[PDB]
Design a protein around this motif. Structure first.
Motif, PDB file in Angstrom:
ATOM      1  N   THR A   1       0.842  -1.213   0.000  1.00 44.37           N
ATOM      2  CA  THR A   1       0.000   0.000   0.000  1.00 44.37           C
ATOM      3  C   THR A   1       0.864   1.245   0.000  1.00 44.37           C
ATOM      4  N   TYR A   2       2.162   1.060   0.081  1.00 41.23           N
ATOM      5  CA  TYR A   2       2.991   2.209   0.142  1.00 41.23           C
ATOM      6  C   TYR A   2       4.033   2.091  -0.972  1.00 41.23           C
ATOM      7  N   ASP A   3       3.792   2.762  -2.101  1.00 35.15           N
ATOM      8  CA  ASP A   3       4.757   2.836  -3.220  1.00 35.15           C
ATOM      9  C   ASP A   3       5.890   3.856  -2.889  1.00 35.15           C
ATOM     10  N   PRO A   4       7.107   3.351  -2.569  1.00 30.92           N
ATOM     11  CA  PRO A   4       8.207   4.227  -2.167  1.00 30.92           C
ATOM     12  C   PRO A   4       8.800   4.957  -3.386  1.00 30.92           C
ATOM     13  N   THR A   5       8.214   4.758  -4.585  1.00 27.07           N
ATOM     14  CA  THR A   5       8.724   5.483  -5.784  1.00 27.07           C
ATOM     15  C   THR A   5       7.769   6.605  -6.191  1.00 27.07           C
ATOM     16  N   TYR A   6       6.587   6.678  -5.533  1.00 24.86           N
ATOM     17  CA  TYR A   6       5.627   7.786  -5.812  1.00 24.86           C
ATOM     18  C   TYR A   6       5.255   7.900  -7.316  1.00 24.86           C
ATOM     19  N   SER A   7       5.128   6.741  -7.985  1.00 24.69           N
ATOM     20  CA  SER A   7       4.973   6.652  -9.429  1.00 24.69           C
ATOM     21  C   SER A   7       3.564   6.937  -9.896  1.00 24.69           C
ATOM     22  N   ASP A   8       2.632   6.940  -8.953  1.00 18.33           N
ATOM     23  CA  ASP A   8       1.253   7.344  -9.240  1.00 18.33           C
ATOM     24  C   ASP A   8       0.990   8.864  -9.285  1.00 18.33           C
ATOM     25  N   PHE A   9       1.920   9.650  -8.775  1.00 19.38           N
ATOM     26  CA  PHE A   9       1.697  11.074  -8.511  1.00 19.38           C
ATOM     27  C   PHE A   9       1.463  11.905  -9.807  1.00 19.38           C
ATOM     28  N   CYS A  10       2.009  11.400 -10.927  1.00 18.35           N
ATOM     29  CA  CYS A  10       1.806  12.051 -12.224  1.00 18.35           C
ATOM     30  C   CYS A  10       0.337  11.902 -12.656  1.00 18.35           C
ATOM     31  N   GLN A  11      -0.425  11.026 -11.987  1.00 16.43           N
ATOM     32  CA  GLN A  11      -1.865  10.910 -12.229  1.00 16.43           C
ATOM     33  C   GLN A  11      -2.738  11.963 -11.480  1.00 16.43           C
ATOM     34  N   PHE A  12      -2.187  12.637 -10.450  1.00 12.73           N
ATOM     35  CA  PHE A  12      -2.949  13.644  -9.695  1.00 12.73           C
ATOM     36  C   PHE A  12      -3.077  14.944 -10.539  1.00 12.73           C
ATOM     37  N   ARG A  13      -4.069  15.787 -10.240  1.00 17.08           N
ATOM     38  CA  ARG A  13      -4.114  17.093 -10.875  1.00 17.08           C
ATOM     39  C   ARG A  13      -2.786  17.822 -10.585  1.00 17.08           C
ATOM     40  N   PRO A  14      -2.275  18.571 -11.576  1.00 14.94           N
ATOM     41  CA  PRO A  14      -0.915  19.057 -11.396  1.00 14.94           C
ATOM     42  C   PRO A  14      -0.705  19.985 -10.215  1.00 14.94           C
ATOM     43  N   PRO A  15       0.532  20.025  -9.690  1.00 14.27           N
ATOM     44  CA  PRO A  15       0.851  21.073  -8.699  1.00 14.27           C
ATOM     45  C   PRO A  15       0.892  22.417  -9.429  1.00 14.27           C
ATOM     46  N   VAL A  16       0.375  23.466  -8.792  1.00  8.57           N
ATOM     47  CA  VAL A  16       0.536  24.853  -9.285  1.00  8.57           C
ATOM     48  C   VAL A  16       1.115  25.672  -8.116  1.00  8.57           C
ATOM     49  N   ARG A  17       2.230  26.337  -8.367  1.00 12.71           N
ATOM     50  CA  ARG A  17       2.867  27.170  -7.362  1.00 12.71           C
ATOM     51  C   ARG A  17       2.907  28.629  -7.847  1.00 12.71           C
ATOM     52  N   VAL A  18       1.836  29.391  -7.544  1.00  4.23           N
ATOM     53  CA  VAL A  18       1.821  30.865  -7.737  1.00  4.23           C
ATOM     54  C   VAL A  18       2.856  31.549  -6.813  1.00  4.23           C
ATOM     55  N   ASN A  19       2.946  32.869  -6.839  1.00  3.33           N
ATOM     56  CA  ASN A  19       3.859  33.494  -5.892  1.00  3.33           C
ATOM     57  C   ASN A  19       3.064  34.140  -4.783  1.00  3.33           C
ATOM     58  N   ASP A  20       3.296  33.694  -3.545  1.00  4.84           N
ATOM     59  CA  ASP A  20       2.596  34.286  -2.393  1.00  4.84           C
ATOM     60  C   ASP A  20       3.512  35.049  -1.412  1.00  4.84           C
ATOM     61  N   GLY A  21       4.766  34.595  -1.295  1.00 11.25           N
ATOM     62  CA  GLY A  21       5.741  35.136  -0.340  1.00 11.25           C
ATOM     63  C   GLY A  21       5.219  36.226   0.585  1.00 11.25           C
TER      64      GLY A  21
END
Ligand SMILES: C[C@@H]1[C@H](O)C=C(C#CC2=CCC[C@@]3(C)[C@@H]2CC[C@@H]3[C@H](C)CCCC(C)(C)O)C[C@H]1O
Length: 253
Positions: free
Chosen positions: A25-45
């Motif tokens: 139940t624990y994939d130590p390669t995180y190979s499924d993560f490309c299936q999630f909606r993408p990360p978006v990192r705006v600028n908040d600082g």
């Protein structure tokens, strides 16, 4: 003085089963993560900006949703858990889910740069990412402290999977009906843990490890209360639910 009872054949089995459950139940390669909606990192600082955008929320909610599914899967293979009524199984899953995700997340956490590193830069998550998902420092900073505290215990994998199982099978969760049965299942796991530590954990001067692990369980309860408070406020943001998943809404709603 202190006795060092050997692990019984049954406790050895319990450890094998749980390690097996974890590896399934624990994939130590995180190979499924490309299936999630993408990360978006705006600028908040900025709380206003981060609530207006919630730019890391779709990605982290998919990640936590995925993680809840793995925990449900892990819980099913805990010796005893299937002897519980389906209703108590659900109560326990729902109340411990965010705690187990915090615990299990410790395997991707690294003190190299205090991040959960699951990649591949895009899948590296920092304090600034969690605030872009609409959470505040009142949760994030004690969470990072807990992650570091946990890393520094240097748990054997045997210890780590037993500690997740104990967290999940807690007789004191609000709304349980068969507290005695749950406490019976937990007591079997805690005795396995205690025995493991004294046999297997070098020197072993730190049998003391057991109380420290129990203290983590208590830390997890305060983190759980805080997350709940902040999830509640996050849920007030219009169209937030689109950024979550049905499973996340059910579990935390
Ligand atoms: C997939 C593996 C594990 O299950 C968890 C991982 C992680 C992580 C996390 C990285 C960034 C912080 C988190 C998102 C999680 C750990 C729990 C954090 C917060 C409090 C959850 C917020 C949820 C919500 C927005 C719905 O309130 C990575 C891997 O170790």
């Amino acid at each position: 003085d202190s006795l060092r009872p050997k692990l019984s054949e049954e406790q050895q089995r319990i450890i094998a089963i749980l390690l097996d459950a974890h590896h399934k139940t624990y994939d130590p390669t995180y190979s499924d993560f490309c299936q999630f909606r993408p990360p978006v990192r705006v600028n908040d600082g900025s709380v206003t900006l981060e609530l207006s955008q919630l730019s890391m929320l779709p990605h982290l909610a998919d990640l936590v949703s995925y993680s809840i599914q793995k925990v449900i899967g892990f819980a099913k293979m805990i010796p005893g858990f299937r002897d519980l009524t389906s209703e108590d199984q659900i109560v326990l899953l729902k109340s411990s889910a965010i705690e187990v995700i915090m615990l299990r997340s410790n395997e991707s956490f690294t003190m190299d740069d205090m991040s959960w590193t699951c990649g591949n830069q895009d899948y590296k998550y920092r304090v600034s990412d969690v605030t872009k998902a609409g959470h505040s420092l009142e949760l994030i900073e004690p969470l990072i402290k807990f992650q570091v505290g946990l890393k520094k215990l240097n748990l054997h994998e045997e210890e780590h999977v037993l500690l997740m199982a104990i967290c999940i099978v807690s007789p004191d969760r609000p709304g349980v009906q068969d507290a005695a049965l749950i406490e019976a299942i937990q007591d079997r796991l805690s005795n396995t843990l205690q025995t493991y530590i004294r046999c297997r954990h070098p020197p072993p001067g730190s049998h003391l490890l057991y109380a420290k692990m129990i203290q983590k369980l208590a830390d997890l309860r305060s983190l759980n209360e805080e997350h709940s408070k902040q999830y509640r406020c996050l849920s007030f943001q219009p169209e937030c639910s689109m950024k979550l998943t049905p499973l996340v809404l059910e579990v935390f709603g």
